[model samples]
Target chain A: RMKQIEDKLEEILXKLXIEXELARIKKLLYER
Target chain B: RMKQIEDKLEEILXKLXIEXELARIKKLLYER
Candidate 1:
């Protein structure tokens, strides 16, 4: 029960790479 | 002049597409 919730939440967090992608995109845009 | 800056900024926005990418990523994460 508790383990299922914790594992699922961790998995979601692991895949949340918006910040990384956003930074990369911004760098490319500004490099001009 | 103004046209040059506006054109450059529009090109950057077209390439950025982070909003669309982020939504797709979020959907994948949520579909579990």
Candidate 2:
């Protein structure tokens, strides 16, 4: 199904996504 | 057609094209 395609792509994209890394930096910049 | 799907994939790639944004954030983390 098309929904699975999105789910699969999310898995692949998360592998490369910097979203969490960005969140980490947000704390790193101010929490220090 | 199959062609429409490639266009959709292109939109996905554009959304995922955060490499430059992350690169700058990397500088922000260190260049401060």
Candidate 3:
């Protein structure tokens, strides 16, 4: 399953992630 | 949209959107 679509949308919404692969660190942060 | 009942939960299925985000009132709060 590709999370890019949702992940990117989420990234844009939360301003937590954008234009990136959501590297390990940021991914972890978002997880929390 | 079926985003989720919980605010902290970004993804309805991915996170414990039901129990987790609901537990925290501030976390569940949002601005229009």
Candidate 4:
């Protein structure tokens, strides 16, 4: 699931994932 | 649109609503 804090969106896209993946997703959301 | 804040799902289910209606919707999401 995803979460929003202030103007930010936080989501655990995967249970077990590399840090790179997490950063990628966050970047996409932040840009969108 | 709706937003997720911390453990809470925050959404503007309506732009203009009566006080009781807002409470009802928040209760539904919380309970669910």
Which predicted model would earn the best DockQ? Answer: 2
Per-residue CA lDDT of candidate 1, range A1-32, in tens? 45544554564454554576656555555763
Better of 1 and 4 by TM-score: 1
Superposition error at B22 for model 2 (Å): 1.6
Relative to the real complex, the DockQ score for model 3 comes to 0.03
TM-score, cand. 4 = 0.24
Cα lDDT of model 1 by residue, B1-32, tens digit: 55555555555545555558765665554453
lDDT of 3 by residue, A1-32 (tens): 24555555555445532213334434444456
Q: Please give the lDDT score at residue B11 for candidate 4.
A: 33
Best by the lDDT measure: 2
TM-scores, one per candidate:
0.43, 0.50, 0.21, 0.24
**Could you say which candidate leads in TM-score?**
2
Candidate 4 Cα misplacement greater than 4 A, ranges? A1-17, B1-32
Q: lDDT of candidate 3?
A: 0.40
lDDT of 3 by residue, B1-32 (tens): 23422333445334333343343333433420
Those runs of model 1 whose alpha carbons end farther than 4 Å from true positions after fitting are: B1-32
How many times do residue backbones clash in model 4?
0
Which residue pairs in candidate 2 collide? none
Residue range B1-32, candidate 4, lDDT tens digits: 24334334223322222335445644554455
The residue-by-residue lDDT of candidate 2 on B1-32, one tens digit each, is 55566567657767666756776787788767
Best-to-worst lDDT order: 2, 1, 3, 4
Off by over 4 Å in 2: A1-8
Q: Model 3: how far is B16 from its true place, Å?
A: 26
DockQ of 4: 0.06
